[PDB]
Structure formats: structure tokens, C-alpha cells
Amino acid sequence: GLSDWELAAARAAIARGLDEDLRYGPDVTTLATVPASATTTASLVTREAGVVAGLDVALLTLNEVLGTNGYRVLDRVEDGARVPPGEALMTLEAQTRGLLTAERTMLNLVGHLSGIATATAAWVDAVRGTKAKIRDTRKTLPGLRALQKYAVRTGGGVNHRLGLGDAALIKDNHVAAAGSVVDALRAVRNAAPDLPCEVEVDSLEQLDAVLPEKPELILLDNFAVWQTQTAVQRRDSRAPTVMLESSGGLSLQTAATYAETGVDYLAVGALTHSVRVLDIGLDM
Amino acid sequence: GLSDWELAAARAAIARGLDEDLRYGPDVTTLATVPASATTTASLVTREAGVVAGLDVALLTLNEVLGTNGYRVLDRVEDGARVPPGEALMTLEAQTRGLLTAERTMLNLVGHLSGIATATAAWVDAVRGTKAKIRDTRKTLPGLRALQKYAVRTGGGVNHRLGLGDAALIKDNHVAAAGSVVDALRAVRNAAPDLPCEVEVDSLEQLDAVLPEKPELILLDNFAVWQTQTAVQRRDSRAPTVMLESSGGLSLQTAATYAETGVDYLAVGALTHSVRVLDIGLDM
């Protein structure tokens, strides 16, 4: 599931987690109570319902602590699976000391990634029967972007920008320096003609101004549903090729309403900032 | 505010955030619209009320992108400040391109940390007029532990374990291997006599068993209020020196109820997993 870029990011994150955990000394209690030869069958089981994501990251943690052949996976669920409360996501047999050392880092990571996938799946259900797609933002946690981006995709979302040079996004700041939105739009087009041009507008006035310029995407910044409807109507009549994305006053309660206006995407920053963990435990 | 360890953690996190953002190329649009000689006064302003934390981390991001003397702080609030909606947390003058590049990383980091401090401050208010202190856990995001820990302290919480070797914590797994809870307890005492001994129990029977052993702390794993009240009564009469910490079925609505039983600490994993961003913007 994880690509090369994601696999590297995953390894880097697990390595960081373990170091934080092992920086003060080994788990003196398991050393004192559990023999090296001990081995168990343990299960990652959810304490709540949700969508699972990050299971490969769990195996990667074990690889690091136990060695690739330090354990045996007796069974597992696939990432993306919708799962009920006492569901065993993965069952494995491994050295007990290794499992106990890996545990917290492993659980912190899959719990976070499952929290994201869970939430995005809710957004996706909310706008179903609409053409809208749930997209993420750059409002990610430092060091965790590839993984968080991976988890929204697992939940059924689509990734937007990966960084600053990914696409050209004209905002208020650029607009000002350029003079106007269309001034900025033109400047960037002339400077990086091979790059996706996305412009952010906060008024129907700026919208009317940029539509003829035909940028790749216009982000409707904090528009009411009625203004979003209007923006879709004007786009459909004046620049059918311009994609529209709602960004701002979105809540899961208002999701379908906005979606029903016909916008193409809903930019949800909450999917990655503001995430609630999916409670999962290691049962031995 | 930031310790040695925290300042290092912070620099590493901001470094990682910037690399994620600059991995695909520079911000072509600010390069095209704003001249290198440009300078502005910009303000970090909250869009909601809360407790601020991580402002030094903002400064650290600028040092990285702009160089220590690449900007001037005209004004700032102190971390820990309770703040109303349109509050300017920090005002600075800096090279415009530098600010636009640093923006997303800087906002992602203080928004998260403020999110944590704000939440912990709420828990701390919830239990006021009680002797209970709010404590954090090892349920942190990989690579962000020092920062998350710092933020709960800023909101008035108290940090607990920093890692695995930090203190001896006897759980179910250890008890079994040892034979019993007291067996495990004795083994660790004998192996690491200079280490704080914390034992986790899930029943009043196990509690009765370990109390005489006088561990430093007992974590009441998922006890009902009535059982917590009983645990406190038993501790007060049998082992007055043993600290009691509620862990598990805690919510901000029930926090006072648990606190009123007389427990010494409330372990709140939600302070660090499950955090809601404090919405902050950079206004120019």
C-alpha cells in the first residue's frame, strides 16, 4: 500500500518514535519479568468502530525491533477496511519482549492514521450522490505529511498539494503584490507556464474577475452555500473547464449542502489538523 | 520555556516541516509576484479563543528560513496566555518572501501546540477545587513528543513518563509472566530499586493485592466512579503514601466527578492524541 516515498517516511517516523521511547533506557520491567525466549500471539484490536489504515506501518515497527523474521503474521485485515469495535485487525506471533517494546510506537501510529481515514470516510459518505471529492490540505503535522496524506487516500479522499512547488497557488498576498488577482495570475502564468495554476478568491467579485483567465482551479474561500451555488452557475456558463473547490466554513453537518451546489471538491483541513485517534490496543 | 531537549526537538520538527514543503521546488508564485527586497509587518492572529503555546517555535522557523536577524519582532504575547478571538499573538517585520515560505510550517506547529495547551487548560479548569493534577501520557505523535509534552505543561498539566526507561510500570503482561502483580512488583523492585514503581490495576481485587507493596503510583485502569471512590477509601486507610491515577474512561464532562473522589491524577491521553488545532492566521 505504502509507496517508496511513503515507506521511507514511515521508516523515518517509526525510527523517531522508538528513539523517543528508548532514549531513557530499556523497558526494565519486561527485562525483569519476561524471558528472552518467550513468544506470544497478540492481536491489534480496535476498541471502537472506524476505518483501518497504517497496518503496514505496524509491521515496519516490528521489523525494526524484532528483525524481518522476528515474528509471524497469523492473520490481518486490509488497510481501508471498515471495522466494528472488537475487531482483530492483525494477529501475530512474536517474541514477547519485542512486542512490548514496539507497542506504544506502533499503536500511536496506526491509531493516528486510522483516526484520519475514519474521519475522511465520514466526509466521503456525507457527500455521496454528489460529484464532489474530499481533498486534503497542507495543514499537516511536521514530519508526518506523506503518512497523513496516505491515510486520507485510504479513507477515500484525494490528495491535493504535497508542498509549495507542487502547483502555483495565488492567494491574497500574491494578488496584492501583483496589484490584483488577475495581475498575479498573469505574472505566475508568465513565470511558470508549465505549472497548475490555482487561485484563491474570497468574493464573487474576484471570482468574476478570474474566471475568464481560466485558471486550473479556483478555491472558494469561506463562501456561504448560496454564493457557492452562484459561483458554480457562473463557472458553468463562463469557464466550464475551471474546477471549483470549497474551502473554509465547512463542517460535516454542512458538507452535503455545499456538495449539492455542484462544486468539484471540498478542501478539508480538519482531516489532518484536528485528528481524533482510533482507539486500538495490543491484546496478548 | 523550551528546554535544551525541546529546543532540539523543535528545530528538528521545523526542519522536517520545511523539507516537506520545499522538496518539490520553491514557491514559484511568490518568486513571480513579490520582489526579494520586499518587507512587511505581519501578525499571527487567532481566529478563536484559547491558550497560546509554541510562539518560540514560530521564531525558530523564521531563524531557519530568514536567518536569526532576518526579521524583527515588534510585539508578542507570552506562551500560556489565555487569548480572545481576534488577538495578535505576535507582530513582526520581515522579508516578505521569507514569511510566505515559513507560513504554513509555522502555523501548523503553533496551531497544534496551542490546540494542546488550550485543551489541557480546559481539563485543569474542570477539576479545580480538587487536588487532582492533569497528567499526560506516552500516547504522543512520533517525533513530536518533546513539543507535545511542553504544550501540556504550558496549559497547566504535568508531564508523566517521557519514555520506556523513565519509570517501571507493571501491567497485565508483566503480572502474568511474574505469576502475579506482587511477583512482578518484587522482581522489578529488586532489579531497579532506584526507579519509581508504578503499577496498573483493572480491578479492586488487584488493587487490594498491590496496596501493601506500596508502589509509588497505581493507575486505576477503567474504573467506574463508584469503584474509584472505593479505591481511594482503601488507599487512604491502608497505604496513604501510594498515589492514585485514573486512566481510561475519562472525558471532560466526567472529569470533575472522578476528581471529586479524591484521586491524585487524571491521566488524559486525549491531550496528545486527538488534538484540535487552535486556528491561527498570518495576516499581512
Domain containing A73 — which CATH number?
A: 3.90.1170.20
Stretch 33-72 of chain A: residues touching chain B, C-beta under 8 Å: 33-35, 38
| B281 inside domain | yes
Q: Convert chain B into a string of H (helix), E (strand) and C (coil).
A: CCCHHHHHHHHHHHHHHHHHHHCCCCCHHHHHHCCCCCEEEEEEEECCCEECCCHHHHHHHHHHHHCCCCEEEEEECCCCCEECCCCEEEEEEEEHHHHHHHHHHHHHHHHHHHHHHHHHHHHHHHCECECCEEECCCCCCCCCHHHHHHHHHHCCCECCCCCCCCCEEECHHHHHHHCCHHHHHHHHHHHCCCCCEEEEECCHHHHHHHHHHCCCEEEEECCCHHHHHHHHHHHHHHCCCCEEEEECCCCCCCHHHHHHCCCCEEECHHHCCCECCCCEEEEC
Name the minimum distance, in Å, from the CA of A131 to any CA of chain B.
Answer: 29
Same structural domain, B132 and B142: yes
Distance of CA B35 to the CA centre of its chain: 40
Same structural domain, B148 and B253: yes
| B230 inside domain | yes
Same structural domain, B125 and B245: yes
Task: Report the SS3 class of residue A27.
Answer: coil
Same structural domain, B75 and B165: no
| A70 inside domain | yes
- Contact indicator for A188, A168 with CB cutoff of 8 Å: yes
Name the minimum distance, in Å, from the CA of A209 to any CA of chain B.
Answer: 18
Q: How far apart are CA A132 and CA B181, in angstroms?
A: 55
- Per-residue buried b or exposed e for A221-260, using 16+ beta carbons within 10 Å of the residue's own CB: bebeeeebbebbebbeeebeebbbbbbeebeeeebbbbbb
Same structural domain, A170 and A234: yes
- Is A238 annotated to bind a ligand? Reply is no
- Is A139 annotated to bind a ligand? Reply is yes
Same structural domain, B131 and B165: yes
**Chain B contact for A224 (CB, 8 A cutoff):** no
Q: Convert A187-222 into a string of H (helix), E (strand) and C (coil).
A: HHHHHCCCCCEEEEECCHHHHHHHHHHCCCEEEEEC
Q: What is the resolution of this structure in A?
A: 2.4
A200 in active site: yes
**Chain A contact for B24 (CB, 8 A cutoff):** yes
Q: Do A140 and B284 touch (CB under 8 A)?
A: no
Name the minimum distance, in Å, from the CA of A29 to any CA of chain B.
Answer: 6
Same structural domain, B253 and B124: yes
Distance of CA B144 to the CA centre of its chain: 9
Same structural domain, A281 and A258: no
Domain count, chain A: 2
Angle, nearest 10°, between helix axes B4-22 and B55-66? 50
Q: How far apart are CA B109 and CA B115, in angstroms?
A: 10
Q: Where are the alpha helices (DSSP H) in A53-134?
A: 55-66, 96-126
Give, in order, the Cα–Cα distances in Å from A139 to each of A31, A145, B21, B109.
41, 9, 11, 10
- Per-residue buried b or exposed e for B196-213, using 16+ beta carbons within 10 Å of the residue's own CB: ebbbbbbeeebbebbbeb
Q: Which of A141, A170, A176 sits opposite B144 (nearest CB)?
A: A141
Distance of CA A270 to the CA centre of its chain: 9
| Residue span of the structural domain in which A54 resides | 10-118+275-284
Q: How far apart are CA A110 and CA A17, in angstroms?
A: 12
- Establish how many alpha carbons lie within 13 A of residue B157's alpha carbon, considering only the half-sphere containing its beta carbon: 31
Same structural domain, A133 and A250: yes
* Torsion angle defined by CA atoms of residues A20, B10, B143 and B246, in that order, rounded to the nearest 10 degrees: 70
Q: How far apart are CA B183 and CA B58, in angstroms?
A: 49
- Establish how many alpha carbons lie within 13 A of residue B133's alpha carbon, considering only the half-sphere containing its beta carbon: 12
How far does chain B reach from its first CA to its final CA, in angstroms? 28
Task: Report the SS3 class of residue A33.
Answer: helix
Q: How far apart are CA B228 and CA B210, in angstroms?
A: 15
CATH number for position B211: 3.20.20.70
Same structural domain, A167 and A253: yes
Q: How far apart are CA B18 and CA B102, in angstroms?
A: 7
Closest CA to B163 of A259, A28, A22, A175: A22
Q: How far apart are CA A169 and CA A232, in angstroms?
A: 20
Quote the cell numbers at residue A184: 498575479
| B3 inside domain | no
Same structural domain, B201 and B89: no
- Contact indicator for A174, B29 with CB cutoff of 8 Å: yes
CB atoms within 10 A of CB B8: 12
- Establish how many alpha carbons lie within 13 A of residue B259's alpha carbon, considering only the half-sphere containing its beta carbon: 22
Radius of gyration of chain B from its Cα atoms, rounded to whole angstroms: 23
Residues in chain B: 284
| A5 inside domain | no
Backbone angles phi, psi at A173, to 5 degrees: -60, -45
- Establish how many alpha carbons lie within 13 A of residue A114's alpha carbon, considering only the half-sphere containing its beta carbon: 33
| B2 inside domain | no
| A151 inside domain | yes
Radius of gyration of chain A from its Cα atoms, rounded to whole angstroms: 23
Positions of B annotated as catalytic residues are: 104, 139, 171, 200, 221
Same structural domain, B256 and B282: no
| B183 inside domain | yes
- Is A235 annotated to bind a ligand? Reply is no
Element (H, E) at A83: strand A82-83
Of all residues in chain A, the one with the smallest CA distance to B30 is A174
